[PDB]
């Protein structure tokens, strides 16, 4: 279609938004493929890291007696 973008073998209709890896994000803007990556910016060492599936970065859980912010 008119203003679609080919990467990877895929096509993708214009203003398409996608993530081809959980920290890379996406866009289809006339012909052009435009992506940005993700960088996590990990603010404190945490015990428990866990990234949820599909996500790039990570979530440091924290019970409600200490939960603020």
Same mark, same amino acid.
């Given at each position: 279609? !008119?203003?679609?973008? @080919?990467?990877?073998?895929?096509?993708?209709? =214009?203003?398409? @938004?996608?993530?081809?890896?959980?920290?890379?994000?996406? &866009?289809? =803007?006339?012909?052009? &493929? $435009?992506?940005?990556?993700? *960088?996590?910016?990990? @603010?404190?060492?945490? $015990?428990?890291?866990? *990234?949820?599936?599909?996500?790039?970065?990570? *979530?440091?859980?924290?019970? $409600? !007696?200490? !939960?603020?912010?």
């Amino acid at each position: 279609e !008119a203003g679609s973008c @080919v990467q990877d073998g895929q096509r993708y209709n =214009d203003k398409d @938004v996608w993530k081809p890896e959980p920290c890379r994000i996406c &866009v289809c =803007d006339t012909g052009t &493929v $435009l992506c940005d990556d993700i *960088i996590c910016e990990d @603010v404190k060492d945490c $015990l428990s890291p866990e *990234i949820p599936f599909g996500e790039c970065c990570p *979530i440091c859980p924290t019970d $409600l !007696a200490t !939960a603020s912010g």
